[PDB]
Amino acid sequence: GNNQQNY
Amino acid sequence: GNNQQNY
Amino acid sequence: GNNQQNY
Amino acid sequence: GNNQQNY
Amino acid sequence: GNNQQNY
Amino acid sequence: GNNQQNY
Amino acid sequence: GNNQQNY
Amino acid sequence: GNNQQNY
Amino acid sequence: GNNQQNY
Amino acid sequence: GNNQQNY
Amino acid sequence: GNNQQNY
Amino acid sequence: GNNQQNY
Amino acid sequence: GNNQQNY
Amino acid sequence: GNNQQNY
Amino acid sequence: GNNQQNY
Amino acid sequence: GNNQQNY
Amino acid sequence: GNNQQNY
Amino acid sequence: GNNQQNY
């Protein structure tokens, strides 16, 4: 699906 | 499904 | 915090 | 905190 | 705390 | 605390 | 405490 | 305490 | 925080 | 099913 | 079923 | 069934 | 299903 | 924070 | 922050 | 799907 | 899909 | 899709 990554 | 990762 | 919305 | 909503 | 809602 | 709701 | 609801 | 509800 | 919306 | 992990 | 883990 | 674990 | 991980 | 909108 | 909109 | 990464 | 990276 | 990179 849609992807958001907050490192 | 949709993905959110908060490191 | 961080926000992801999948309509 | 962090938020993910899947409608 | 952290929030996930699956409608 | 942390929240998960599956409608 | 922590919350999980399965409707 | 911690909460789980299965409707 | 950071924002991603998928309409 | 749907997945939420709070480390 | 649906999964919530609070470490 | 549905799963909640509070460590 | 849909995925949220809070490290 | 940073913004991405997909209409 | 930085902005990207996809109409 | 659509991608947003915040390093 | 569409891509936004914030280094 | 469309690309924006902020170094």
From Swiss-Prot, chains A, B, C, D, E, F, G, H, I, J, K, L, M, N, O, P, Q, R:
It is found in: Cytoplasm. [PSI+] is the prion form of SUP35. [PSI+] is the result of a conformational change of the cellular SUP35 protein that becomes self-propagating and infectious. This conformational change generates a form of SUP35 that assembles into amyloid fibrils. [PSI+]-aggregates sequester soluble SUP35, resulting in defects in faithful translation termination by read-through of translation termination codons. [PSI+] can be cured by GdnHCl and by deletion of the molecular chaperone HSP104, which is required for [PSI+] propagation. Belongs to the TRAFAC class translation factor GTPase superfamily. Classic translation factor GTPase family. ERF3 subfamily. Heterodimer of two subunits, one of which binds GTP. Interacts with polyadenylate-binding protein PAB1, and TPA1. GTPase component of the eRF1-eRF3-GTP ternary complex, a ternary complex that mediates translation termination in response to the termination codons UAA, UAG and UGA. SUP35/eRF3 mediates SUP45/eRF1 delivery to stop codons: The eRF1-eRF3-GTP complex binds to a stop codon in the ribosomal A-site. GTP hydrolysis by SUP35/eRF3 induces a conformational change that leads to its dissociation, permitting SUP45/eRF1 to accommodate fully in the A-site. Recruited by polyadenylate-binding protein PAB1 to poly(A)-tails of mRNAs. The prion domain (PrD) is a Gln/Asn (Q/N)-rich domain, which is unstructured in its native, soluble form, and which forms a parallel in-register beta-sheet in its amyloid form. This is Eukaryotic peptide chain release factor GTP-binding subunit. It comes from Saccharomyces cerevisiae (strain ATCC 204508 / S288c) (Baker's yeast). The gene is SUP35.
